[PDB]
Coordinates of N, CA, C and O in Angstrom, one line a residue:
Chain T
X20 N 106.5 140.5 87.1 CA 107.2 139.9 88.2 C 107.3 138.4 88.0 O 106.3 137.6 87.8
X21 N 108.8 137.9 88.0 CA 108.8 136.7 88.0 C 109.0 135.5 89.3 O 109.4 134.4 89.5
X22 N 108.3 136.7 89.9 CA 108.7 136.1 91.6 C 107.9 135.2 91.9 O 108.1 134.8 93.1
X23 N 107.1 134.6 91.4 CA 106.0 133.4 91.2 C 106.9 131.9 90.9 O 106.4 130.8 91.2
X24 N 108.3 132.0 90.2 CA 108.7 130.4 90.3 C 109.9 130.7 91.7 O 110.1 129.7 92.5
X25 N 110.4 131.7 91.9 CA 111.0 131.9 93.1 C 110.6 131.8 95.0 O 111.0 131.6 96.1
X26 N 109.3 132.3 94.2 CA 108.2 131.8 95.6 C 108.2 130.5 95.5 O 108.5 129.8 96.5
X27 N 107.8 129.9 94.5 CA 107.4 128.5 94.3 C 108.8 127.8 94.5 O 108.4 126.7 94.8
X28 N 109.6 127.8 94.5 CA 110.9 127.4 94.8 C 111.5 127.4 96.6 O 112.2 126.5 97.2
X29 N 110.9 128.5 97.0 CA 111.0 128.4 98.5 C 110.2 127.4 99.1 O 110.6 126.6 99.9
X30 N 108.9 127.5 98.7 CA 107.5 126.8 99.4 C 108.8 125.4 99.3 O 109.6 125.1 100.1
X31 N 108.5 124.9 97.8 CA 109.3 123.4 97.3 C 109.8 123.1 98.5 O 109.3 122.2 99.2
X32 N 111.1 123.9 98.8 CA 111.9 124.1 99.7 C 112.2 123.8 101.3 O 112.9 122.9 101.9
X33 N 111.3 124.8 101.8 CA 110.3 124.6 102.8 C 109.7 123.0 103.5 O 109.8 122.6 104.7
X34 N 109.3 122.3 102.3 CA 108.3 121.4 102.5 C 109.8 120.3 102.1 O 109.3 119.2 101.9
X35 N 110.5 120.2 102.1 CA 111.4 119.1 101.4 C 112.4 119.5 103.0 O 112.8 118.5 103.5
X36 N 112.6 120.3 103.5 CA 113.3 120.7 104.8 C 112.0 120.2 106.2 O 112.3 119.7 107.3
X37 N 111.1 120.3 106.0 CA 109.8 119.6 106.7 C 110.3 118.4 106.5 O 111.0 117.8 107.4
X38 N 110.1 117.8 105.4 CA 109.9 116.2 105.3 C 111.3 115.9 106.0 O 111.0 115.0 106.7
X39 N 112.6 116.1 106.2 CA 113.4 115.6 106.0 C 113.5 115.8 107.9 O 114.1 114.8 108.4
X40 N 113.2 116.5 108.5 CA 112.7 116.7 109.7 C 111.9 115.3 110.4 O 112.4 114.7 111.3
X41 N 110.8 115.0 109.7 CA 109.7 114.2 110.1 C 110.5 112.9 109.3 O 110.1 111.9 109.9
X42 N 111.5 112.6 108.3 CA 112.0 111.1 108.2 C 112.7 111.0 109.1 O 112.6 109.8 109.4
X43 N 113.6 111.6 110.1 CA 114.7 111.9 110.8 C 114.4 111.6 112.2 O 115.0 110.7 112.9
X44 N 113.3 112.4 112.6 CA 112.5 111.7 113.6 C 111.5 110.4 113.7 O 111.3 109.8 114.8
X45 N 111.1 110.1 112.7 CA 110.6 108.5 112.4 C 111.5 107.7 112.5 O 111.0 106.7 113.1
X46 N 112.6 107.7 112.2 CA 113.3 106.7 112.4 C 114.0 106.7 114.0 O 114.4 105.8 114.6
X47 N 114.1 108.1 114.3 CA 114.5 107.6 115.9 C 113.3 107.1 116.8 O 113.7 106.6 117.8
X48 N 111.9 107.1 116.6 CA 110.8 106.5 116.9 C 110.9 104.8 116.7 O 110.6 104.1 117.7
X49 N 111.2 104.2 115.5 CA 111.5 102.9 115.3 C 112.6 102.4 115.8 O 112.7 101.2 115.8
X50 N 113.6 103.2 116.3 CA 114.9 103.1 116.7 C 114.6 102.9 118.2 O 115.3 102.0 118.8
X51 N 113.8 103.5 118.8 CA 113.1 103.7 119.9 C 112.1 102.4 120.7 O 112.0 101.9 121.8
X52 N 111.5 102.3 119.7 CA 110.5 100.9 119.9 C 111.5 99.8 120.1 O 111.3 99.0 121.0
X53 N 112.5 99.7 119.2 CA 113.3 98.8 118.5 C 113.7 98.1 119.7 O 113.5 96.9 120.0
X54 N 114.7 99.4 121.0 CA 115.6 99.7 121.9 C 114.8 99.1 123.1 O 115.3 98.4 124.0
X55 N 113.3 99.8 123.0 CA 112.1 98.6 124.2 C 112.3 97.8 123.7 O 113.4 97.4 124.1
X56 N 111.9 97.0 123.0 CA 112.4 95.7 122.7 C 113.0 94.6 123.3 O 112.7 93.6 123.9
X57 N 114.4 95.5 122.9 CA 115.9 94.9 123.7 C 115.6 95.0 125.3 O 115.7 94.1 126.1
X58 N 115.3 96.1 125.5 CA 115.4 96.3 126.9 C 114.5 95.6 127.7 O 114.5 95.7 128.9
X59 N 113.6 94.9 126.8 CA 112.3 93.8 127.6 C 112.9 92.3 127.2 O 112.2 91.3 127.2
X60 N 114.5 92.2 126.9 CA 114.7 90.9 126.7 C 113.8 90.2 126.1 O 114.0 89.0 125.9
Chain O
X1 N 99.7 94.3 135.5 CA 99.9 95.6 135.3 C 101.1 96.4 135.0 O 101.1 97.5 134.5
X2 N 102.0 95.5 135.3 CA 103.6 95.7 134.7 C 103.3 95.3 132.7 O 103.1 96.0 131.7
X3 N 103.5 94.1 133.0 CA 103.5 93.8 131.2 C 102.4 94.5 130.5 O 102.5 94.7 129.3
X4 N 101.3 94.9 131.2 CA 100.4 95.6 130.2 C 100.5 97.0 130.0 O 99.7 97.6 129.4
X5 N 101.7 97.7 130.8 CA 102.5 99.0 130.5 C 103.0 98.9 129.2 O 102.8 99.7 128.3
X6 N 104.0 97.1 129.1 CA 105.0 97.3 128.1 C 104.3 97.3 126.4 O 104.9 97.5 125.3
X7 N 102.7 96.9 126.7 CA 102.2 97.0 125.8 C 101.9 98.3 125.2 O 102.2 98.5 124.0
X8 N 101.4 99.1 126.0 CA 100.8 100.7 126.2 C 102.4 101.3 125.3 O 102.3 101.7 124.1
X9 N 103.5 101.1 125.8 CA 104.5 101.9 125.3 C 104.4 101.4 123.7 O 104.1 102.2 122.8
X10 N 104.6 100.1 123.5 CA 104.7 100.2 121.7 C 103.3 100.3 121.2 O 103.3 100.5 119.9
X11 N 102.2 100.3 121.7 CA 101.3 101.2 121.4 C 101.5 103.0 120.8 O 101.1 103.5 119.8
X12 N 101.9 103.4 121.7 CA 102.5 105.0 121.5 C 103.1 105.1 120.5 O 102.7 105.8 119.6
X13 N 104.2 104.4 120.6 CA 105.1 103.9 119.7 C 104.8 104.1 118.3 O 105.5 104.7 117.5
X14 N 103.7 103.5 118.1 CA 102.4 103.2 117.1 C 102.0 104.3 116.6 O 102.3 104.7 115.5
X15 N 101.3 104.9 117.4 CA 100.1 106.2 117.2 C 101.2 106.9 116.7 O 100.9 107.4 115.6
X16 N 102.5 107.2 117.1 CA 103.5 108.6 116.7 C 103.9 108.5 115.7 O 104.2 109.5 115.1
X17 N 104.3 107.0 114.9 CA 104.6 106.1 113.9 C 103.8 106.5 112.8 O 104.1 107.0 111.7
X18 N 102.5 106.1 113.2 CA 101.2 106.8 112.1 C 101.3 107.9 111.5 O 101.4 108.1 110.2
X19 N 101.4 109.0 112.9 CA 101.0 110.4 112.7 C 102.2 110.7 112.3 O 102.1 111.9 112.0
X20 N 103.4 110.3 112.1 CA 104.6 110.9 111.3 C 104.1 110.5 109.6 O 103.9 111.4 108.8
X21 N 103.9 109.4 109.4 CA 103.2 109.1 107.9 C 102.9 109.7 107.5 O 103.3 110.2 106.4
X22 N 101.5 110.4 108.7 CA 100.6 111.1 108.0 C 100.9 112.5 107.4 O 100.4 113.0 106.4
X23 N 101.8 113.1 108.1 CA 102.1 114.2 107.7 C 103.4 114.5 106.6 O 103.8 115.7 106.2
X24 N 104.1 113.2 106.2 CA 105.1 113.2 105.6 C 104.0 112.9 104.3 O 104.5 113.2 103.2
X25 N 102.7 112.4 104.3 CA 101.4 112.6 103.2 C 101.0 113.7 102.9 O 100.8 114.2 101.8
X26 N 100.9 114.1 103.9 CA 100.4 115.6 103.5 C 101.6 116.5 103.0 O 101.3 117.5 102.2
X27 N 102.6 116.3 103.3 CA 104.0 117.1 103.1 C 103.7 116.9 101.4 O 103.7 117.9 100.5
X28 N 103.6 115.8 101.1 CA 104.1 115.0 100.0 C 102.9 116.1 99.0 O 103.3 117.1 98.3
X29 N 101.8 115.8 99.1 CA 100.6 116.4 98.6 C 100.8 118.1 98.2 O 100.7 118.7 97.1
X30 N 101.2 118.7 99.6 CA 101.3 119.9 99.3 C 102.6 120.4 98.1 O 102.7 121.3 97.3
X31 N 103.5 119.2 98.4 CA 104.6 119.8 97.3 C 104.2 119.3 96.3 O 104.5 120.2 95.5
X32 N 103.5 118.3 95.6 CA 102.7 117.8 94.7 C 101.9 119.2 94.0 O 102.2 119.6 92.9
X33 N 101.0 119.7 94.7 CA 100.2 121.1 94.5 C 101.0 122.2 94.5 O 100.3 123.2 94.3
X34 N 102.7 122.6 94.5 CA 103.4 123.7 94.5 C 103.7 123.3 92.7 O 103.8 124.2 91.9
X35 N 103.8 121.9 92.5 CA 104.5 121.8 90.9 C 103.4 121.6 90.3 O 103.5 120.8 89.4
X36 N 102.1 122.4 90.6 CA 101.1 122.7 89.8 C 100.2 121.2 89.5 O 99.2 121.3 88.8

């Protein structure tokens, strides 16, 4: 069975769809702070 | 008690800032450990 780099290709996968989740959200957080900011003159 | 709210919020700010790091480390790590 060569289902061992195809597994390992999902996990990859998986985890690169996570991250991209959690950069996407980080930046509406700094976006966020940014916008108190402004809004505190 | 007003201004020391507006502190409190970019505090939060902070802590959620961290904990996204943290786990885009750990993200990082575990795909690190998938390419053996």
């Amino acid at each position: 069975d060569g289902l061992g780099e195809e597994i390992e290709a999902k996990a990859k996968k998986i985890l690169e769809d996570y991250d991209k989740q959690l950069q996407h959200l980080k930046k509406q957080v700094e976006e966020a702070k940014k916008d108190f900011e402004e809004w505190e003159k």
